[PDB]
A paper describes a structure:
To define the structural basis of [name] activation by eCBs, we determined a cryo-EM structure of [name] bound to the eCB analog AMG315 in a complex with heterotrimeric Gi1 protein. [name] bound to AMG315 and ZCZ formed a complex with Gi1 that was stable enough for cryoEM imaging yielding a density map at a global nominal resolution of 2.8 Å. However, we were unable to see any density in the region described in this previous study, and hence we do not model ZCZ in our structure. The cryoEM map shows well-defined density that allows unambiguous modeling of AMG315 and all the protein components of the [name]–Gi1 complex. The acyl chain of AMG315 is buried deep in the binding pocket, while the polar head group is closer to the extracellular pocket, interacting with the ‘lid-like’ N-terminus and pointing into a largely positive cavity formed by the TM1–TM7 interface. In addition to most of the hydrophobic and polar interactions made by FUB and AM841, AMG315, through its carbonyl head group, interacts with residues, F268ECL2 and I267ECL2 in ECL2. The interactions of AMG315 with these regions might explain its 20-fold selectivity for [name] over CB217. In the case of AMG315, the methyl group at C-13 (S-stereochemistry) interacts with the “toggle switch” residues (black circle). Upon AMG315 binding, the N-terminus of [name] is displaced from the transmembrane core, followed by the inward displacement of TM1 and TM2. This inward movement of TM2 is accompanied by the repositioning of residues F1702.57, F1742.61, F1772.64, and H1782.65, that rotate towards and interact with the agonist.
Residue numbers in the entry:
A (entry chain B): 3 to 340
B (entry chain A): 3 to 54, 182 to 232, 240 to 354
C (entry chain C): 7 to 63
D (entry chain D): 104 to 306, 336 to 412
E (entry chain S): 2 to 121, 124 to 235
């Protein structure tokens, strides 16, 4: 009755594995030889943002690369001015349990969410001189993990239950759903063309989705524990993942398999966040041992360290122009490095 | 000064925001926060009614002291991902039903949950308040059914006091950490009016010891 | 119950076996060409002088 | 004259030198290790309670060094110096001792505040307030020490010079003796109240707190009684060769407090011991 | 959003008067406020200013020690007390809004104004035209020159353009060199450099007729420019 279907699934998996194995002609390290290394990289703190009285959980840069937004365990969303360190806006939240935030690419709206299973959208530019709640989106059954704007009227979300969704802000209803995971979805990343996105769950797997049709395209495996971070290559044809194994990995789409892994014998803790650099030559990772590491993307070499925090590093980000790097931590302080 | 007439106003605005944040932080540090755990069919609703969607909230006051209670029993997700958010609470309240001993086994599930929570790495130095509910039912069943279904090794007498002491010591001997934290046990039923007083006493003791440890006098 | 899930799994696993794949050499050479065509504009690799830095002080 | 005050016999001189040298070395070594452990730990550094311990260690170090140097110079080599340099050294020693007593007073106040208002202990005490009180205390100590050089000098005015300290009038000596006693009484009353309240609440902690507070009070009284007794008698009474000899030995007892303060306040804290073990 | 202004009337020389303004429709407690005045036929003139929180106050050199300005945030009112009124104090008074943070637009909303009659090292902004004729559908340009560079080290050029129509209070069009306000069409444009600035209109309708003013915000006391009237 059902044994035949399971045997067919096993046969298909074996066929896929053989097909992938046929394309592997040469490893990345072999090609990336006779190329001059990058050398030691030294970067200095330049700013320090203060005024948060709890642990910081998320942050996001603005498209102008001057303004910032950050969230904390206390019910507060603060917007910063990078160059002067001035505070522009402080927004109070109804629920103190928050886990993610986003910045609209136009600069008119912000988004928030957490353990309450709701996504709140706030309007920044109005005619009364205050910030007010513009929309509340509900329908998930688990805590929200991430959210990202596509335009002024579209947003995708990820939930603690095995599902992602696409919303319509005007009507407040869901227009598409993505269900192929068995675990908890922890992160997602959008493509530069805003046509595809990738997800990572607690079953040690990653998936590639199509926004319009709403179907999965490819699945990637190789990790041994939960995946907590994921990011896109600047070109848009590869991505990087980080898990609890204390290792990072690089995956390719056209080849449909893994390319390289970044690990060190003296690192035994998990990874909380991952980011790339303009031109995609440096990979920045945040660890649980109060530090941040810089890796060469084309080589397994480690080209620097970033140690200025007294607790766990929760989040990090790079500007669209590529001038500075921002990091947050559980010590309640955000820093900017250049 | 190298500042135009329009940046000083921004500085003043930022300073007024800082003042507001300070006042907010000061007003939020005068409340005592508690986390309520326990498996289903334990008596959480009874105690909640005796004291005044995802996570749930509750507030009450006693002797000019304000308590907030967090209930997280409606999540139904991986607990290793969002439980570190509660690191920092004053204490934890655990509910267990004495009646459901003969009723794989509910008592063993409660013991497993208690052991898992007590020896967590985020709750190393947080005390625990244990409530044992439905004493009358336990005293109405012990006479008919012996206390050997749960513990085949039991070698005592079919008496309420001895059985209650046996259960209490079995629950109390699961904490590997003995010097860092202490457990406060209490017996209650469906009709009581002195549980909030017990909570108040335990909280005052915990706060005094924490203060006496921050100042290095211990 | 157990039939619908198996059918869905088989169909989904059947649509992922028709993709066209290229050799790892070609995929590994385009990343190297991209990193070489944009190396002249990357502030974090080559620190620019202290005049264009908006975070100098 | 500076020749009349020197009374120590040739036999007594040997003891003063050996005791001062060895005891002084322990004072500097103990305070040095304590300062580094509270400087190499992020957890200890943030706490606004170890700042007072570090201040006490620094004050004890400076006082020990200055006192040893001045005492050996005066009572071994028979060095003769003008009024200005001698009064400068005396002011330095006074500044160190006053700073040490002030640090002890601040620690006692912090520990009293903990038990007085258990719920409001954290709200009241804050790091900037600790820094403010640390700098105010040091500034007032420095001002008190420097007061004699500006004016008021017995040699530069008409008054009765002191019988133990050349070129010192019998008014500033009393001033120091009048402020030290008040601070010590507040440091004995705070601990008495702490013990009483702990006992009242307990009716395990009582045994521990009593075993630690009795030791602290006993050490303080035994170490600060004899010297102040001789000083007060001096001001109100005559001077004899016997009184001069005992006072010289009593100064030696005061330096021992700088070598016992770092073993009670450092070891009785478990966090400090854990940090020291981790560092090793 | 509205601001109503009370008080005003006929006063004898040497008297005293009180003027009040009531706001409704916005967060009155997070805005700074100004007072401006206009003589019967002359241009605009700044008077005084209050910060948000009443932590900073400024006055014009001609009213120092004679006028007082105050605020009341729970009741949403603004007050101006005038003493020892001269014969040069006859004018129409306006109350103005201003909010200061990165990327804001000050001087964006004005009041209706009240009339008061009395019985009988500063930058200079100059305009060298007036009563310029025009026909609908054509393109027009207006010019302005200052007596000092308005360009700051941070890269901002502080210059503002205002339009007043017959029988109406002024309205903001450009709240900084090359920055269009909200709700105003795209016909208007502004450009300049250093000490020379210009405002250009592609094509004008019948409603784009009035008087145009130029203002600087580099430093106090916020001097105004002269008017430039357009005739159909
Ligand atoms: C100004 C009052 C605070 C003064 C500081 C408080 C207490 C300290 C522990 C006491 C004395 C300062 C110690 C050494 C200074 C160098 C020489 C002292 C020679 C005077 C002398 O010893 N005279 C007797 C009779 C003969 O030996």
């Amino acid at each position: 009755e059902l044994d035949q279907l399971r045997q067919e699934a096993e046969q298909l998996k074996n066929q896929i594995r053989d097909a992938r194995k046929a394309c592997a002609d040469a490893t990345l390290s072999q090609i990336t030889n006779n190329i001059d290394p990058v050398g030691r990289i030294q970067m200095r703190t330049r700013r320090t943002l203060r005024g948060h009285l709890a642990k910081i959980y998320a942050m996001h840069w603005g498209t102008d690369s001057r303004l910032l937004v950050s969230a904390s365990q206390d019910g507060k969303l603060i917007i910063w001015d990078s160059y002067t360190t001035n505070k522009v806006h402080a927004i109070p939240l109804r629920s103190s349990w928050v886990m993610t935030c986003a910045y609209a690419p136009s600069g008119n709206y912000v988004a928030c969410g957490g353990l309450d299973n709701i996504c709140s959208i706030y309007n920044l530019k109005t005619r009364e001189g205050n910030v007010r709640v513009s929309r509340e989106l509900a329908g998930h059954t688990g805590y929200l993990s991430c959210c990202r704007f596509l335009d002024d009227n579209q947003i995708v979300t990820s939930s603690g239950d095995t599902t992602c969704a696409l919303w319509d802000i005007e009507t407040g209803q869901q227009t598409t759903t993505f269900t192929g995971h068995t675990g908890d979805v922890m992160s997602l990343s959008l493509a530069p063309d805003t046509r595809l996105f990738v997800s990572g769950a607690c079953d040690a797997s990653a998936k590639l989705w199509d926004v319009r049709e709403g179907m999965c395209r490819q699945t990637f495996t190789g990790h041994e524990s939960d995946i907590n971070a994921i990011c896109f290559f600047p070109n848009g044809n590869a991505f990087a993942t980080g898990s609890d194994d204390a290792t990072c990995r690089l995956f390719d789409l056209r080849a449909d398999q893994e390319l390289m892994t970044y690990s060190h014998d003296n690192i035994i803790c998990g990874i909380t966040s991952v980011s790339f650099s303009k031109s995609g030559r440096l990979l920045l990772a945040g660890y649980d041992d109060f530090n941040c590491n810089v890796w060469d993307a084309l080589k397994a070499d480690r080209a620097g360290v970033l140690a200025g925090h007294d607790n766990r590093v929760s989040c990090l980000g790079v500007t669209d122009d590529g001038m500075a790097v921002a990091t947050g931590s559980w010590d309640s302080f955000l820093k900017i490095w250049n | 000064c190298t500042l135009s007439a329009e940046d000083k106003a921004a500085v003043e605005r930022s300073k007024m925001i800082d003042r507001n944040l300070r006042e907010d932080g000061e007003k939020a540090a005068r409340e005592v926060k508690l986390l309520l755990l326990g498996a289903g069919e334990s008596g959480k609703s009874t105690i909640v009614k005796q004291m005044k969607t995802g996570i749930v909230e509750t507030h009450f006051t006693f002797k000019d002291l304000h308590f907030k209670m967090f209930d997280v029993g409606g999540q139904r997700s991986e607990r290793k991902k969002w439980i570190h958010c509660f690191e920092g609470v004053t204490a934890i309240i655990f509910c267990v039903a004495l009646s459901d001993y003969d009723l794989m086994n509910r008592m063993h599930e409660s013991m497993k949950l208690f052991d898992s929570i007590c020896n967590n790495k985020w709750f190393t130095d947080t005390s625990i308040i244990l409530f044992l509910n439905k004493k009358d039912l336990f005293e109405e069943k012990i006479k008919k059914s012996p206390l050997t279904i749960c513990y085949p090794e039991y070698a005592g007498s079919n008496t309420y006091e001895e059985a209650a002491a046996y259960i209490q010591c079995q629950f109390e001997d699961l904490n590997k950490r003995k010097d860092t934290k202490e457990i406060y046990t209490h017996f209650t039923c469906a009709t009581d009016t002195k549980n909030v007083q017990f909570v108040f006493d335990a909280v005052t003791d915990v706060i005094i010891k924490n203060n006496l440890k921050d100042c290095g006098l211990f | 119950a157990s039939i619908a899930q198996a059918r869905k799994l088989v169909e989904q696993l059947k649509m992922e076996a028709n993709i066209d794949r290229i050799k790892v050499s070609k995929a590994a050479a385009d990343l190297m060409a991209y990193c070489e065509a944009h190396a002249k504009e990357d502030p974090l690799l080559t620190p620019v002088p202290a005049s264009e830095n908006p975070f100098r002080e | 004259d500076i020749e009349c005050f020197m009374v120590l016999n040739p036999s007594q001189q040997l003891a003063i030198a050996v005791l001062s040298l060895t005891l002084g070395t322990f004072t500097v070594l103990e305070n040095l290790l304590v300062l580094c452990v509270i400087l190499h730990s992020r957890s200890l550094r943030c706490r606004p309670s170890y700042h007072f311990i570090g201040s006490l260690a620094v004050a004890d170090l400076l006082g020990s060094v200055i006192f040893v140097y001045s005492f050996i110079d005066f009572h071994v080599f028979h060095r003769k110096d003008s009024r200005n340099v001698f009064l400068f050294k005396l002011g330095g020693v006074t500044a160190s001792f006053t700073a040490s007593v002030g640090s002890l007073f601040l620690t006692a106040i912090d520990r009293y505040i903990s038990i007085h208002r258990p719920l409001a202990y954290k709200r009241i005490v804050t790091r900037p307030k600790a820094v403010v009180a640390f700098c105010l205390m040091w500034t007032i100590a420095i001002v008190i020490a420097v007061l004699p050089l500006l004016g008021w000098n017995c040699e530069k005015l008409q008054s009765v010079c002191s019988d133990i300290f050349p070129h010192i009038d019998e008014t500033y000596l009393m001033f120091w003796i009048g402020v030290t006693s008040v601070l010590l009484l507040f440091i004995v009353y705070a601990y008495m109240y702490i013990l009483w309240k702990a006992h009242s609440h307990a009716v395990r902690m009582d045994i521990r707190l009593a075993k630690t507070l009795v030791l602290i009070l006993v050490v303080l009284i035994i170490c600060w009684g004899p010297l102040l007794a001789i000083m007060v008698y001096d001001v109100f009474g005559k001077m004899n060769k016997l009184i001069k000899t005992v006072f010289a030995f009593c100064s030696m007892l005061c330096l021992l407090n700088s070598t016992v303060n770092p073993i009670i306040y450092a070891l009785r804290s478990k966090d400090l011991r854990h940090a020291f073990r981790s560092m090793f | 959003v509205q601001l109503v202004e009370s008080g005003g009337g006929l006063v004898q020389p040497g008297g005293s008067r009180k003027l009040s303004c009531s706001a409704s429709g916005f967060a009155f407690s997070s805005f700074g406020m100004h007072w401006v005045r206009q003589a019967p036929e002359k241009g605009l003139e700044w008077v005084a200013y209050i910060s948000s929180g009443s932590g900073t106050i400024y006055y014009a050199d001609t009213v120092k020690g004679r006028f007082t300005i105050s605020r009341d945030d729970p009741k949403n009112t603004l007050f101006l007390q005038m003493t020892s009124l001269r014969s040069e104090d006859t004018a129409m008074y306006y109350c103005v809004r201003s909010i200061y943070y990165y990327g804001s637009s000050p001087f964006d909303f004005w009041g209706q104004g009240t009339t008061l009659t009395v019985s009988s090292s500063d930058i200079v902004m100059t305009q060298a035209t007036s009563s310029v004729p025009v026909t609908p559908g054509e393109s027009v340009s207006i010019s302005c020159r200052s007596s000092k560079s308005l360009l700051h080290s941070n890269g901002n050029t502080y210059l503002y353009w205002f339009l007043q129509r017959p029988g109406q209070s002024p309205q903001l069009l450009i709240y900084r060199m090359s920055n269009l306000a909200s709700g105003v069409p795209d016909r208007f444009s502004g450009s300049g450099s250093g000490t020379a600035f210009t405002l250009t209109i592609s094509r004008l309708e019948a409603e784009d007729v009035g008087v145009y003013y130029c203002m600087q915000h580099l430093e106090y006391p916020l001097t105004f420019g002269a008017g430039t009237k357009l005739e159909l």
